[PDB]
Design a protein around this ligand. Structure first.
Ligand code: HEM
Ligand SMILES: CCOC(=O)C1=C(COCCN)NC(C)=C(C(=O)OC)[C@H]1c1ccccc1Cl
Ligand SMILES: CCOC(=O)C1=C(COCCN)NC(C)=C(C(=O)OC)[C@H]1c1ccccc1Cl
Length: 465
C-alpha cells in the first residue's frame, strides 16, 4: 500500500497544530489509540513513521535490520558533526567505526586498566566527596554529571578530573548547556523549518559555538597524545585510535583514517552525556519515595558484599533484588521515550505498508517499557517487575531501554556497569534523607524536549558508623 495511516496534515505545518500541549509524547500516544501501533505523523513538512509495542519495534530493527538501521538527521547538530561519529554516522563510515569501538571496548583493559577498575575508583572518589559533605542537603545533578563524564574521560583521555577542577566544570557546563539548547522551544522548531530558519541566527549558531570550543580541548589533547605515544603500551582510547591509524596507513583503503579523529571522540562524549547521570538522578529520587526499597537493597549489599570492600561487577549475579531495583529504575525513567531517530535505507514493506528510502522513523520505546502485558500496572515504581515468585531475577523481551538491533546502544556495557557500581557503592556507605515526606514526592518527569528529566530535589547522604 502506502505510508501508514494518520491525522490529516496541512501543507507545511504537517500535523503540528493537532499535537497536545505540551505532552508531545502524549500526542504520539493519542495518535496510537486512534491509528494503531503503526501510524504516520507529519512533523512539519516532513513525514515521520512512528512504531509502538515490542512486536513492532522488534519487527523493524531485528527482523528488518537491512532496512531500519539508519540514523536520522538532527539538524541542530549535523552542521557540526557532518556525519562523523558512531551515533551520527551511517553506511560504511558507521559499519567501520561501530566495529572498531566494539573491539576496542572488548579488548580494553586487556592490556591496560579495566573499565570496572575505573568505575571503582571514581566510585571511591565519589564517596569521599559525599562524605566531605558532612550530611548536608544538596542537589546531586552536578556530581552525577561529573562522575559519568569522568568515566568517559578516564577511558578516552586516560584520566579523570578533580570535581573542583575549573577547567573541568567549564567543559561540563558547556555540554549541559548545549543539551538544553537543543531541548529548547527553538531547537525543536529548528528541526523542522531549518530549511529557511538556518539563515537567521538562533540557538543553532550558539550550539555550534559551544561544540567548537569543547572540540578545541580534544584536538589539543590528541596532540599531547601523539607526543607521548608508546606503540607497545597504549594508555587509553585515543592512544588506541592513533595506533589504529598507523597500522591503517599501511593499507590502501583506510575508510577509517579518512575520518575526523576529534569529532568521532566528541561524538562519543555526546552520546554518553546526560545518560546515566539522569538515570542515577532519577534513581535516588525514587529511593526517597520508596525508602523500604532503599533499605532492602542495603541489606542485600550488607549480606552479599558487607560494609567495607568495594562492590564489584561479579557481585551482580548474587544480588538479584538490586539488579531488579536497577532495572525498574531504568524502565520507569524512560530516559528517551522515543529512541534516536532512524531512517530506512532501502524501500521496504512493513505490515503491508510501503515505506520509502530515506523516511525518518521513531521507535517509541516508552511504549515497550510500559506494556501492561509485560508490566502489571506499568505507571508505578515496582522492582517486583523484574522478580519472580522465588524472588529470582526476571528478565523480559520488553525491557529495551537501550533499543535493539544494529544501532543498539554502544554504551550498554559501560552503562550497566556504572549504574551498579555507583548505585551499590553509594548505598554501601550512605543512607538517604530529605525534608520532604515520601508520599509528597512528585515523580513527574519534566519531559522537556526529547528526554525525560526528573524534577530537581534536595537530598542528603548519611554515613552508617
Ligand atoms: C542509561 C544510559 C543509556 C541509555 C538508556 C542509552 C540508550 C541508548 C539508545 C536508546 C540508543 C539508540 C539506539 C537506537 O537507535 O535504538 C543508544 C545509542 C547509543 N548510545 Fe546509548 N545509552 C545510554 C548510555 C550511553 C552511554 C554512557 C554511552 C557512551 C558510551 C552511549 C553511547 C551510545 C552510542 C555510541 C549509541 C549509538 C551507537 C550506534 O548507534 O551504533 N549510550 N543508547
Ligand atoms: C543524537 C544525540 O542525542 C543524544 O545523544 C541524546 C542523549 C544522549 O544519550 C543518547 C545516547 N545514548 N540524551 C539526550 C538528553 C538527548 C537530548 O536530545 O536531550 C535533549 C539526546 C539527543 C541529543 C541531541 C539531539 C537528539 C537527541 Cl535524541
Ligand atoms: C524531528 C523534529 O524534531 C522535533 O520536532 C522534535 C520535537 C518536536 O517539538 C515540538 C514542539 N512544538 N520534540 C521532540 C520530542 C523531538 C524529539 O526528537 O523527541 C524524540 C524533536 C525531534 C524530533 C525528531 C528528530 C529530532 C528532534 Cl530534536
Amino acid at each position: 500500500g502506502k505510508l501508514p495511516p494518520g491525522p490529516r496534515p496541512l501543507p507545511l505545518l504537517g500535523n503540528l497544530l493537532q499535537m497536545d500541549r505540551r505532552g508531545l509524547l502524549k500526542s504520539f500516544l493519542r495518535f496510537r489509540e486512534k491509528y494503531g501501533d503503526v501510524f504516520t505523523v507529519h512533523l512539519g513538512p516532513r513525514p515521520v513513521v512512528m512504531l509502538c509495542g515490542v512486536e513492532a519495534i522488534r519487527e523493524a530493527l531485528v527482523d528488518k535490520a537491512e532496512a531500519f538501521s539508519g540514523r536520522g538527521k538532527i539538524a541542530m547538530v549535523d552542521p557540526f558533526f557532518r556525519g562523523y561519529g558512531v551515533i551520527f554516522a551511517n553506511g560504511n563510515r558507521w559499519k567501520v567505526l561501530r566495529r572498531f569501538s566494539v573491539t576496542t571496548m572488548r579488548d580494553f583493559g586487556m592490556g591496560k586498566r579495566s573499565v570496572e577498575e575505573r568505575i571503582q575508583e571514581e566510585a571511591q572518589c565519589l564517596i569521599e566527596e559525599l562524605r566531605k559533605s558532612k550530611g548536608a542537603l544538596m542537589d546531586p545533578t552536578f556530581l552525577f554529571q561529573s562522575i559519568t563524564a569522568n568515566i568517559i574521560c578516564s577511558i578516552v583521555f586516560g584520566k579523570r578530573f578533580h570535581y573542583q577542577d575549573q577547567e573541568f566544570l567549564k567543559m561540563l557546563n558547556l555540554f549541559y548547556q548545549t543539551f538544553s539548547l537543543i531541548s529548547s522551544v527553538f531547537g525543536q522548531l529548528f528541526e523542522l523549518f531549518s530549511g529557511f530558519l538556518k539563515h537567521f541566527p538562533g540557538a543553532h549558531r550558539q550550539v555550534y559555538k559551544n561544540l567548537q570550543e569543547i572540540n578545541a580541548y580534544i584536538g589539543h589533547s590528541v596532540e599531547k597524545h601523539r607526543e607521548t605515544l608508546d606503540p607497545s603500551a597504549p594508555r587509553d582510547l585515543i592512544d588506541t585510535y592513533l595506533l589504529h591509524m598507523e597500522k591503517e596507513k599501511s593499507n590502501a583503503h583506510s575508510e577509517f583514517s579518512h575520518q575526523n579523529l576529534n569529532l568521532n571522540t566528541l561524538s562519543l562524549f555526546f552520546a554518553g552525556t546526560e545518560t546515566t547521570s539522569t538515570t542515577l538522578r532519577y534513581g535516588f529520587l525514587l529511593m526517597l519515595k520508596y525508602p523500604h526499597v532503599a533499605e532492602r537493597v542495603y541489606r542485600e549489599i550488607e549480606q552479599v558484599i558487607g560494609p567495607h570492600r568495594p562492590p564489584e561487577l561479579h557481585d551482580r549475579a548474587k544480588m538479584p533484588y538490586t539488579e531488579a531495583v536497577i532495572y525498574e529504575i531504568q524502565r520507569f525513567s524512560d530516559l528517551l521515550p522515543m529512541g534516536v531517530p532512524h531512517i530506512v535505507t532501502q524501500h521496504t514493506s512493513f505490515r503491508g505498508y510501503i515505506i520509502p528510502k530515506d523516511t525518518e522513523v521513531f521507535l517509541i520505546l516508552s511504549t515497550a517499557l510500559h506494556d501492561p502485558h509485560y508490566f502489571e500496572k506499568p505507571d508505578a515504581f515496582n522492582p517486583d517487575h523484574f522478580l519472580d515468585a522465588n524472588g529470582a531475577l526476571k528478565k523480559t523481551e520488553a525491557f529495551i531501554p537501550f533499543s535493539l538491533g544494529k544501532r543498539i546502544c554502544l554504551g550498554e556495557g559501560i552503562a550497566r556497569a556504572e549504574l551498579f557500581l555507583f548505585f551499590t557503592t553509594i548505598l554501601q556507605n550512605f543512607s538517604m534523607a530529605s525534608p520532604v515526606a515520601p508520599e509528597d514526592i512528585d515523580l513527574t518527569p519534566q519531559e522537556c524536549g526529547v528526554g525525560k528529566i526528573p524534577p530537581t530535589y534536595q537530598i542528603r547522604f548519611l554515613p552508617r558508623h
